[PDB]
């Protein structure tokens, strides 16, 4: 049971090794648009938080799950930020989420005061007062119920079928990362020019014993002019200086 679009889930993904090769055994995926990353290189990167949102939508609105879009899904049901670096996955589920005789359990909000902020979730059911007069909880003329149920008969065109959507959104940067792909570690060598990767930091240089002190909250002190100069192993906590 995916949740309906006005009240979407949000699974926070904690520490793991994340094989994305899976997620490639579910269907043809009517879509699959990775935005900040390219999907062929996901199994070799470290991310800090991977937020997975999940909902259902009609088929002609799958193009509205994108950064900076308009229409009655992206304005006020689910707003992606313009600083987006995730991946939008969407596949048809007319064989599961739609029954004969109307499926009145998928609803979308069509009237609101104004738009949402990015990643904003509302579960309000207060009657939007369009007209100048109050109608005090009794809908009708110039004040309507805000959550309208979808249709999802099976005999609807593609473009009115229930499409399930999972939006992955994850940021890679400060802090550790916690969750990273399967890269298979490797023996650490010292005093040799090598090609190194320290939990996401890709570079070249000679590794040497340092004399700097990162405090348990520090992961890699760059130098003046903003270039990485020291790192701390990802499973030993040894501080090592780097130099071209």
């Amino acid at each position, epitope marked *: 049971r995916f949740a309906s679009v006005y009240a979407w889930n949000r699974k926070r993904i904690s520490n793991c090794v994340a094989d994305y090769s899976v997620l490639y055994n579910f269907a043809p995926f009517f879509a699959f648009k990775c935005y900040g990353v390219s999907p062929t290189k996901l199994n070799d990167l470290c991310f800090t938080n991977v937020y997975a949102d999940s909902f259902v939508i009609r088929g002609n609105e799958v193009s509205q799950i994108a950064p900076g879009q308009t229409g009655n899904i992206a304005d006020y049901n689910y707003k992606l930020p313009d600083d987006f670096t995730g991946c939008v996955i969407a596949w048809n589920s007319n*064989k599961l989420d739609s029954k*004969v005789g109307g499926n009145y359990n998928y609803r979308y909000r069509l009237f609101r005061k104004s738009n949402l902020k990015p990643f904003e979730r509302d579960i309000s059911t207060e009657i939007y007062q369009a007209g100048n007069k109050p109608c005090n909880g009794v809908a009708g003329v110039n004040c309507y119920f805000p959550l309208q149920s979808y249709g999802f008969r099976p005999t609807y*065109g593609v473009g009115h079928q229930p499409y399930r959507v999972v939006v992955l959104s994850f940021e890679l940067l400060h802090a550790p990362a916690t969750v990273c792909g399967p890269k298979k570690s490797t023996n650490l060598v010292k005093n040799k020019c090598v090609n190194f990767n320290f939990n996401g930091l890709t570079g070249t240089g000679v590794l040497t014993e340092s004399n700097k002190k990162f405090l348990p909250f520090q992961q890699f002190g760059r130098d003046i002019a903003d270039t990485t100069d020291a790192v701390r192993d990802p499973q030993t906590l040894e501080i090592l200086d780097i130099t071209p």
Partner: antibody
Amino acid sequence: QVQLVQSGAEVKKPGASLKVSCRASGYTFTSHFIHWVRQAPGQGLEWMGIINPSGGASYAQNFRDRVTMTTDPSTSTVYMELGSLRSEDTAVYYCARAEGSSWLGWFDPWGQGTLVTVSS
Amino acid sequence: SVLTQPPSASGTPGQRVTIPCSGSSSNIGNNYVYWYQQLPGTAPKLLVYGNNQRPSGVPDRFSVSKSGTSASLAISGLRSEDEADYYCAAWDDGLSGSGWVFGGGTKLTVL
């Protein structure tokens, strides 16, 4: 031993309505959705509707706005009502039973067939 | 009518006749096919379904084939009961509508 029986029909003037029955027997009534299919003589077949035998229904969109269905899961019958008939709707209608789950499935029991016609 | 079937076919008892039905990705390239036999003056029955399975009450001399966006039915050794109309069935999801679409059928007989 499992059969879907109907009512014999007659000439009907155009613009009128037509309620036709489909009585199910021999098995569990609320276990199998019902297909309604139609065939004009000297032509192919085209299906009208699909019915939850205790629930709702859905329709083929080429034949929307003129067909209604009703379940009646006490004397084990479903019904098809077609109003504003025309002269090109002279055909024979079969009432088939489907597989126990949703729309995709085989159509194992079939109706005897009903003749629908218009004349003067 | 979106499906494509030959309008007629003929043969002799002892010959292998194939009846095809080719459609599209919406029609066939994404949803099993089913084969129904209409004998004149009766209701249709089952012949073959699911591209590998056959129901009861039928000799398995009838066979099913599927090549991409096409399917067909094969009959070796005709008899006098095989002068009938044959239809193939498939679900389809189209832009204008969706539903349970049929073939045109093929009338098969022996002179």
